[PDB]
Amino acid sequence: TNLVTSSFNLTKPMKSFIRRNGLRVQESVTDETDFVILGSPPLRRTHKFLLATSLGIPLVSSQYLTDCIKSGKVLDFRSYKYKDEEAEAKWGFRLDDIHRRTCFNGKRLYITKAIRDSMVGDSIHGLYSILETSGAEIVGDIKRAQEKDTIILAQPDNDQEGRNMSATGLNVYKIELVALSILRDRIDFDEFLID
Ligand SMILES: [Mg+2]
Ligand code: NA
Ligand code: NA
């Protein structure tokens, strides 16, 4: 059984339980991950959480491993699904909505130069990873971003490409579109439209 943790301090006794009971901690979420343990509420919208949600991987409470130790047994993690009604209301999604996301399947996305340059390193890496994991095609040539139904992600300010594309009549969207659409498995374009 393969698990990942996010926003959680695995203890030494928990690592020993994992080692002795046929569990394995992975560094990254993949299709081979069976569940992700998250730190206790308030839920943090980490990269691992977003990838797990996109891939249909269950999220599990921090209490699971403690109860496994107390019981001396590998309990059913499905009985320890993560709960946070506050986050569900904030972001408009449901944690028990566990399935592979389809909302970016077949979609083409253009990310402006301003975003690419500002996010160089871990941030842009994460954005490309969530998109590609979710079946999106990333467009590199701004001239191809004119093609029908391309989703253009831009900054609301200080973004020459976003400004110029909007000036042609195209719509450009805030980067927050991606994380929230994964959580909802639905793209609510008007919420993210840049004026
Ligand atoms: Mg870590
Ligand atoms: Na962390
Ligand atoms: Na415009």
Curated annotation (Swiss-Prot):
Q: Where in the cell is it found?
A: Nucleus; Chromosome; Cytoplasm, Cytoskeleton, Spindle
Recorded phenotype for the gene knockout or disruption: Strongly resistant to the microtubule depolymerizing drug thiabendazole (TBZ). No effect on DNA damage sensitivity in response to ionizing radiation (IR), ultraviolet (UV), hydroxyurea (HU) or camptothecin (CPT) compared to wild-type.
Q: What is the effect of changing residue 48 to M?
A: Loss of in vitro interaction with phosphorylated hta1 peptide containing the S/T-Q motif. Abolishes ionizing radiation induced foci (IRIF) formation at nuclear DNA double strand breaks (DSBs)
What domain of life does the UniProt record list for this protein's source?
Eukaryota
Q: What is the effect of changing residue 6 to A?
A: Loss of in vitro interaction with phosphorylated hta1 peptide containing the S/T-Q motif. Abolishes ionizing radiation induced foci (IRIF) formation at nuclear DNA double strand breaks (DSBs)
Q: Which residues form the BRCT domain?
A: 1-82
Q: What is known of its domains?
A: The N-terminus adopts a forkhead-associated (FHA) like fold.
> Could you tell me what this protein does?
Involved in DNA damage response (DDR) mediated through its interaction with phosphorylated H2A proteins hta1 and hta2 which mark the discrete foci of DNA damage.
Q: How does it assemble?
A: Homodimer. Interacts (via BRCT domain) with hta1 peptide containing the S/T-Q motif in vitro; this interaction requires phosphorylation of the hta1 peptide at the S/T-Q motif.
The name of this protein is DNA damage response protein Mdb1
* Gene that this polypeptide is encoded by: mdb1
- Which portion of the entire protein is included? 387 to 581 of 624
